[PDB]
Amino acid sequence: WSSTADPLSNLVLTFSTKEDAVAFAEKNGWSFDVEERKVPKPKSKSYGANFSWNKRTRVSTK
Amino acid sequence: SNLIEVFVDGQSVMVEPGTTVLQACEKVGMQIPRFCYHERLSVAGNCRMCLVEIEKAPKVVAACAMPVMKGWNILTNSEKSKKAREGVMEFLLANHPLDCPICDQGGECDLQDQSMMFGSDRSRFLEGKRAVEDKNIGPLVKTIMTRCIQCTRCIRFASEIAGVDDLGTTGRGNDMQVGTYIEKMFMSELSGNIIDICPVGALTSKPYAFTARPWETRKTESIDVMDAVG
Amino acid sequence: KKTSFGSLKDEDRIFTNLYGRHDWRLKGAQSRGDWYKTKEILLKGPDWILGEVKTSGLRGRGGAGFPTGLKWSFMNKPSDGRPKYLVVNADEGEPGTCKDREIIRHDPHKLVEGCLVGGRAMGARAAYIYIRGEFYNEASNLQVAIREAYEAGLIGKNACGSGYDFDVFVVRGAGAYICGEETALIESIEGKQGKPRLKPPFPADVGVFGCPTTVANVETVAVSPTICRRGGAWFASFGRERNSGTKLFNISGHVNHPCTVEEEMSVPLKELIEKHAGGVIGGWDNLLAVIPGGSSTPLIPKSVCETVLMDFDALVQAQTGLGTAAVIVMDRSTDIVKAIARLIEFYKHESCGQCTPCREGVDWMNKVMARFVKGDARPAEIDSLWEISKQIEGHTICALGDGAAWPVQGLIRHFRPELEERMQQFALQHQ
């Protein structure tokens, strides 16, 4: 079986905001690394671009 | 500027021209159900799972392909859109094989989750299901096409992202199948991504087969070192 | 002002060579009045032709019935750099329908002249006629007529003493009923599978080769030169309001003399059948049901057919729709359930399979109707089949799903006792 010696291997906390997590980590005396949230950037979708007259976006099959 | 005012469940939002109904609903915080639409691929509009009701309109529209018009009110949780979702899920599950215990994508299935969240809880399909023969496209992707829902995500990804036109649809109607029509291996430096894009267990990782379940795995975010892209 | 319809004078018809008894070549068309003063009609301008088509009250002969003037004026926008094309829908896929084949094989010069007139009205540089693949001899006749038109200068470089260049191409399909749908037809022309594309974009914006395009039925294109020559008021004098003109009718099934005939628009169904088809085999009382507008229209029983008019509005009021004006009759000695199941099997074999509702649901309804024919089902499944048809209808990419759901709905609505009685006979005989 998989054995462990640390008690914090399964401890995961949920926070509403980044500031709440940072404050909780600071008041508990834990050194922390913060990663900025990754958001998928908005994209331009056009069904009519599939059947293009002169561009490469024209599809060969559908 | 050129922003237009549209409504999602009665709440106003300003969107750029050409924005689809799905993106307008995303700007509010709702994810419309989908099977064939991918943000990275060209719009297909064939799974019909994204059908949604526009207020004062008798016919539902495909949210992934329909550009939103100024003043539209999208009823994302009306009885019409819910009934459309239930009907589409029923049609999708009519021929699907009872392979969940043996399917590698048990706890990671978009079909399973969207059936739980938007479909019914029972079936009235009393006929026999279809079965299609599997394909061999190399040692990386395992192919079980009875689970395929014909969303054509793999074909679009291969054509547009991987630059390989070896995938397509043969046949017609219910007997239309996704494949190569010949014994040919889909080998490219980006061939493994069709496993991720496939919403069902039709395409699965062959070296990963049968080894683990998603709820058991611990997720570590790291960086690739196989090349200099990182 | 007129109240009674159904007596169209012979000299007042358009397709004067419907039966192929005259010369279909250029000389016969010139004798019958084709290619006459087309130069002046071309010189009147697209706006005048569009106005004539609009005041004519013409509606699409394909089945949709959309006002042709509005569709053709959707192309009256200025050029943006792309070429403009007119596509003639000659796929001819609906069971019970034979009109386009006859007006192509016997009156091809009317079709070519209508192509030229529509292209001028819409500013199209060329016309692509998508003929059915099975109609090889009809396509060859159309090619011969187009060659005659090119030799005479009626089409091509300057096409007249007019200054307008217009080309007419014939492209053959290969065995696909779905290729009659306008977007599926456009895809099939471009060399792909006959899978329809979503709307928007409409063909007037993005069509064949990504260019502005109008897809028009063969009859709609063929009647335009006569409408221009005789005026839109004359064509509007026929039929009821919003239902003006004349129509080609195909009567097939259980009639003594199945035939194709052109008749005034809002003709009564029984009067049409008795005067042209020779009546129902075994008499009018022997009639059981009628499919009035091809396989996509729901059936109606004899009681409805007693006093029903053959036009868009009155047939919609009968919960049927005019469709392609293809009348399929059925007497009391035939299995209505078997015929409806055969139609559903046709739709199952003709669906392109692009979208899940049509594909899966139509296969499901085919299986359900096959079980219904033998009576191997239970009465509670009729409402389940109705709900399945509701789920298919209005949720598909194209109207093939609607055209498959509607016959089931009509059959259920008008013959539920028949299905229940068949099921109970099966139940007693199998215990």
Added chain:
Amino acid sequence: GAGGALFVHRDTPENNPDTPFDFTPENYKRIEAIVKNYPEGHKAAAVLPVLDLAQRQNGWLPISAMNKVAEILQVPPMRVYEVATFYTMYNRKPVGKYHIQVCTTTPCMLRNSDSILEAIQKKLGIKVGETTPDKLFTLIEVECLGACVNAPMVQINDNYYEDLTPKDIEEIIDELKAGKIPKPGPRSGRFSCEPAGGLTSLTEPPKGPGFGVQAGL
């Protein structure tokens, strides 16, 4: 009900990429004309006519013919495979000299198309989807062929045989066996689908040019 034809290709000694196929120079000129019919930015629009010409030259469509078409039109072979497998007029297996297509759709089924099918089966000694031992005839059930007025009807190699009775179709079959082509068109002498004894329309001579031309034109 069911299809019965597979949409996956397995290499076979008589159907493989090494199977010899090439276009006759006259067919090459025809291909040039077909390609010329389309704008010189979209050459893939000619896949259907070129595949049809290949079938007419060969009788059916081997995988080598599809590969040749794809190479000639510079399109991926998978697109040609999709076109070949989507459209029902393409024969991906060898077919008899005379391909007999019998329509069993409801308008023809009403006018006893089953009798025509049974007569053909009894005369040829084959089932619905089989081929004769001498590779001369092939029987196939098809949907509406656009000749519902002249039901029942069959199609044999681009020709329509209409208003058929079992005797009439037996005569057609044995005369086609004899060697010369029977005349196409309806039987019973009704001259392409007007009422058999009715003549209820188009009785008087058609009006000439300018009969009803409006004023100011």
Added chain:
Amino acid sequence: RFRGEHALRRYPSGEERCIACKLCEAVCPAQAITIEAEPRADGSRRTTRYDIDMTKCIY
């Protein structure tokens, strides 16, 4: 209905019924089941480890 000692069953042909779906391991309220699996020599989906801790099981 009474629950006794755990056992792994097999089909009448003699092949074991377990297909390593790990649903029992997921549902086990005491985490008494440990499962490891891989494709078999014939490609079947079978377990290589199936452990039940009877001193953790709640039956």
Added chain:
Amino acid sequence: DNSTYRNLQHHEYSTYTFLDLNVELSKFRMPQPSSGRQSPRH
């Protein structure tokens, strides 16, 4: 006059009649438009 059927030319159509007619018509067509590229894959 009317009783005579005059669509008899189609009984003598061969396997290449359509394509031969297209080849004949090839010389009557206006030059085709161009999208600027050899193919969308270019």
